[PDB]
Amino acid sequence: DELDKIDLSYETTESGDTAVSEDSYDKYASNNTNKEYVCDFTDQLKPTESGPKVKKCEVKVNEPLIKVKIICPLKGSVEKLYDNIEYVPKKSPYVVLTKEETKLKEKLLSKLIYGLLISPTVNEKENNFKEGVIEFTLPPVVHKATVFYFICDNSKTEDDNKKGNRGIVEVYVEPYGNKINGCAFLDEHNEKIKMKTFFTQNIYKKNNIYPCYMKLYSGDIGGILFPKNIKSTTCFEEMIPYNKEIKWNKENKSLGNLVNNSVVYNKEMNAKYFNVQYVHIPTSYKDTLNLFCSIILKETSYLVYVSINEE
Ligand SMILES: *[C@@H]1O[C@H](CO[C@@H]2O[C@@H](C)[C@@H](O)[C@@H](O)[C@@H]2O)[C@@H](O[C@@H]2O[C@H](CO)[C@@H](O)[C@H](O)[C@H]2NC(C)=O)[C@H](O)[C@H]1NC(C)=O
Ligand SMILES: [K+]
């Protein structure tokens, strides 16, 4: 579909048309708060008499579940300042740029990093630079170093004898993690192999004997790759303690309600490509729980077991 169609002929360079040499970039780190790394070009690209400059924001990731956020001012949003701004790729963040020879060329981000989460929306607006901001969350595990780029280029905006600047985001993801504690429900080529290697327990449709068992401790990250024919799941909005009596009219209890400061990722299961959810148990949380949820298939259910801080 149009959301992520690659243009194989597109090519640019870091400098674009600015005639600014790479040895003359203004390079700086992303602004990182907890696990959100932000490249904000709101006050970096305005026309000045010494423009164009190149403003290069460097995102360096070596730990799991980092959310990257890039803010690029909209064309026409302020008088004069952004008259000719442009962003590349237009289909960011589904499409990114990577280095090939001296050039930057388009690649599918999801093919680069298995399990990366792109939500359809950012604060109830479409996840696309036309709305001013894009976001994506990196997964619990990354196997190979990956470097990719975005462009937010105001250098063609000319005001009197002033020119805007060209903004670059370089995201450098180093490898981290090995496998995700949890389960992959597989159907039984490159994508099929990844699906088999990323979770500690694989569950095949035929002749499986062990239910999904997610064993978590303080600080740990868990995850599940849900079956393709999933109809619905109560993981993790309705966990049930299976060491207590089950009453179906009891109110629902989420993992978040049961485990203070736990975080669930892609809880709506609307991220593109990957039918996954990740969970993080805080290091603070020290109690023991034994819970289960369920996965209902499309026309038959799967039981899912979660243990937290088992003695
Ligand atoms: C670096 O970022 C902080 C925090 O930014 C906010 O939180 C991030 C996680 C991200 O979601 C950003 O979009 C947010 O703006 C900045 O601090 C804040 O500054 C703004 C504007 O002055 C203010 O409205 C907020 O109240 C401030 N505090 C918080 C907790 O957001 C900080 O200015 C940034 N520093 C630089 C040099 O850019
Ligand atoms: K009973």
Residue numbers in the entry: 555 to 742, 758 to 868, 876 to 887
Quoted from the paper:
To elucidate the structure of the first two 6-cys domains of Pfs230, we expressed Pfs230 D1D2 (aa 587–889), which contains the first two 6-cys domains and Pfs230 Pro-D1D2 (aa 532–889), which has a part of the prodomain and the first two 6-cys domains. For Pfs230 Pro-D1D2, we observed two molecules in the asymmetric unit, which align well with each other and with Pfs230 D1D2 with root mean square deviation (r.m.s.d.) values between 0.234 and 0.390 Å (over 1876 and 1673 atoms, respectively). In contrast with Pfs230 D1D2, the D1 domain of Pfs230 Pro-D1D2 assembles into a four-on-five β-sandwich in which the prodomain residues wind around the core structure of the D1 domain and contribute one β-strand (labeled iii) to each leaf of the β-sandwich. In our crystal structures, we also observed two prodomain residues that interact with the D2 domain; D555 forms a salt bridge with K841 and D558 interacts with Y842. We identified additional contacts between the prodomain and the Pfs230 D2 domain, which were not observed in either previous crystal structures or an AlphaFold prediction of full-length Pfs230. These results suggest that F5 and F10 compete with the prodomain and dislodge it before binding to Pfs230 Pro-D1D2.
Pfs230 is the largest member of the 6-cysteine protein family with 14 consecutive 6-cysteine domains and is expressed on the surface of gametocytes and gametes. In P. falciparum, Pfs230-deficient males are unable to bind to red blood cells and establish exflagellation centers showing that Pfs230 is critical for fertilization and gamete fusion. The 6-cys domain is a β-sandwich fold formed by two β-sheets of mixed parallel and antiparallel β-strands, with typically six disulfide-bonded cysteines that are positionally conserved.
